[PDB]
């Protein structure tokens, strides 16, 4: 894949550690250039700047080359942006954890949900 | 991935071209075993049989190292015996299409939305 998005939710009190050797194996594939985007809630440029902040802090966990990677944040609802995001990249592979670390309740969360059901492109569910 | 489960339905009027260069990319990520399943309705024997030479010529679609290909027939449920064989083998990934090519009514053909919910490892919908 050429163009992947790698949507991480910042707040997850645990961070989805498995999807780590899979978004590094997948961008080795072609190089392919990696979106990370967090989604945050609707002053907002602090709130952006230290959501943007936490998000790099997060892509440091993952072998990627520097020049490789690349940042988002948008507001709003979590599905509709990485949805909106993956048209207009255009993302040719989505990566995306099944649920929370943390709870097991639901084998989907609602965005992975319907992110695999809406996408466009290809979806790879982690778990 | 390690071992690759890879879904085919051989009634598959119209094969589902855009999965070979998933299977194939995925494939040389680790030189995976690549595990070929297709599921038919439940003589017997000459079914199987006829079913299995019907999936190695789909097979032969796909630029894999002939040792690393390996083939399945199962009876039943296809979401049931793709389960069952993803936790035996045990897969690392599945590869499924999202539905069969020629139809769009449904954006995940149950099949696609029963698998990629209920396996315990990574699930790559392609489309
Ligand atoms: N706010 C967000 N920004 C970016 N990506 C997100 C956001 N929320 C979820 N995701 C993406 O979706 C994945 C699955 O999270 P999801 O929210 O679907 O599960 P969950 O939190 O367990 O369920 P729910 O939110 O429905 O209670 C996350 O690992 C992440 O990839
Ligand atoms: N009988 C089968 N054997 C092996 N794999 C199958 C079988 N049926 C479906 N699959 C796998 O699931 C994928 C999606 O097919 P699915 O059956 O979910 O979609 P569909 O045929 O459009 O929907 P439906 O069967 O619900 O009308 C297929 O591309 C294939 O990977
Ligand atoms: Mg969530
Ligand atoms: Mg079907």
Chains 1, 2 share one sequence.
């Not at 072998?63 to 990677?69: A, C, F, G, T």
């Not at 509709?80 to 989505?94: H, T």
Request: net charge negative; proline share 5%; hydrophobic share 45%.
């Amino acid at each position: 894949s050429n163009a992947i998005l790698v949507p991480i939710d910042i707040s997850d009190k645990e961070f989805t550690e498995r999807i780590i050797s899979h978004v590094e194996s997948e961008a080795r594939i072609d190089d392919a250039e990696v979106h990370f985007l967090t989604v945050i809630p609707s002053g907002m440029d602090e709130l952006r700047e230290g959501s943007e902040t936490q998000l790099k802090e997060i892509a440091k966990k993952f072998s990627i080359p520097e020049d490789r990677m690349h940042f988002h944040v948008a507001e709003g609802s979590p599905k509709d942006k990485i949805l909106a995001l993956a048209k207009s990249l255009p993302a040719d592979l989505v990566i995306i954890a099944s649920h929370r670390p943390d709870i097991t309740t639901y084998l989907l969360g609602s965005n992975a949900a319907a992110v695999v059901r809406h996408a466009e492109c290809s979806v790879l569910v982690v778990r």
